[PDB]
Design a protein around this ligand. Structure first.
Ligand SMILES: [Fe+3]
Length: 375
């Protein structure tokens, strides 16, 4: 175990048909193999990792209903500090300010309850400091919702979702972008922004529905990607913009599916100044055989201002991590992405201005669940 190592990798290694996560440190992303032998902390069950401040929340799932805090010890090592509990699942989870995390929790289906809970959790304490519930009604007006992201802006909680039959996983309403706004402290429904320019914003359990930028404005991505969980695709994949602290879409439109060549993006990560590191599906005819597959992904740089998509030719076509948080680190003006190639899984460094990549450290794992950096 390297002391004071800055990079944090959550190596998800599958054994005996079940995945175990090893949260390990790494001092370098270019040479030397990143392994979990005699190093890293073990975590069982299904965990997904989200960082804010200097804390990494390991949120459980598939039955796991606890979120554990991982911080840097005074000795430079990683240590588990603080945990908070819930009853169902954290359907969405971001931060609103420098000290509190906002989290939206939906029931599994209508018969499981008609109340959704919003937790305000302290980042430093890793504990629920506030919670308020609200009705689900303006989310299941078409069908029981599946959340794809949530973020805060000027006292308003914005929740992007798509209607999905919770039993058959059938998405019939794919030609209208839906996003519901709520007053923050009351969690009171305000409006349901619908937009008939593209389909729903985001993908199943992908957390790629909405993201805000430096100006405070927020962007949403619609893909209707069958390969990422949808049953059909009626509209084109594109990006829309909701201004800072508003409840109406502006005249911004970035038709990604046509400007790309019939490709729909699978994962996105805003890296700053209108640039987004994206994994897009190289499958042009997204058939139902490709559903839930997220296979044959290509890394690209998306310029929102100039509305361009540039291929990162140095990263080979690979299969994605499915419906899960996108594991990419925006550090030192570069974007670091673990790519599982034929020879193995390698950390690729991506220069966004040149849209170029350099293969870095090899990582000994099945996949990565979280890629973070601590100081
Ligand atoms: Fe599942």
């Amino acid at each position: 175990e390297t002391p004071f190592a800055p990079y944090v990798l959550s190596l998800g290694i599958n054994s005996n048909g079940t995945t175990t996560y090893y949260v390990v440190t790494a001092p370098e992303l270019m040479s030397g193999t990143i392994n979990a032998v005699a190093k890293g902390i073990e975590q069982n069950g299904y965990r997904d990792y989200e960082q804010a401040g200097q804390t990494v929340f390991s949120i459980g799932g598939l039955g796991l209903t606890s979120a554990t805090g991982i911080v840097r010890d005074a000795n430079g090592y990683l240590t588990e500090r603080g945990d908070f509990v819930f009853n169902s699942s954290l359907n969405a989870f971001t931060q609103m300010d420098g000290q509190n995390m906002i989290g939206l929790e939906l029931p599994a289906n209508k018969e499981s309850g008609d109340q959704m809970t919003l937790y305000t959790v302290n980042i430093s304490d890793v504990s629920i400091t506030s919670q308020v519930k609200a009705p689900v009604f303006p989310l299941n007006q078409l069908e029981w919702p599946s959340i794809t992201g949530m973020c805060y802006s000027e006292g308003n909680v914005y929740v992007t979702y798509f209607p999905m039959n919770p039993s058959t996983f059938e998405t019939l309403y794919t030609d209208t972008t839906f996003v519901a706004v709520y007053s923050y402290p009351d969690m009171q429904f305000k409006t349901l922004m619908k937009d008939t320019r593209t389909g729903p914003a985001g993908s199943w359990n992908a957390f790629n529905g909405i993201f805000k930028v430096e100006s405070g404005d927020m962007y949403i991505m619609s893909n209707s990607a069958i390969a990422n969980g949808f049953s059909q695709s009626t509209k084109n994949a594109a990006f829309l913009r909701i201004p800072k602290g508003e409840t109406h879409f502006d005249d911004y439109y970035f038709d990604f599916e046509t400007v790309s060549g019939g490709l729909k993006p699978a994962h996105i990560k805003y890296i700053g100044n209108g640039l987004v590191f994206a994994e897009v599906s190289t499958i042009s005819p997204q058939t139902s055989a490709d559903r839930w597959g997220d296979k044959s992904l290509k890394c690209c740089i998306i310029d929102l201002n100039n509305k361009t998509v540039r291929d990162i030719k140095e990263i080979p076509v690979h299969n994605g991590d499915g419906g899960r948080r996108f594991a990419a680190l925006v550090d030192g003006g570069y974007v670091y992405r673990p790519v599982t190639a034929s020879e193995g899984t390698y950390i690729y460094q991506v220069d966004p201005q040149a849209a170029t990549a350099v293969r870095g450290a090899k990582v000994s794992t099945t996949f990565v669940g979280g890629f973070f950096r601590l100081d």
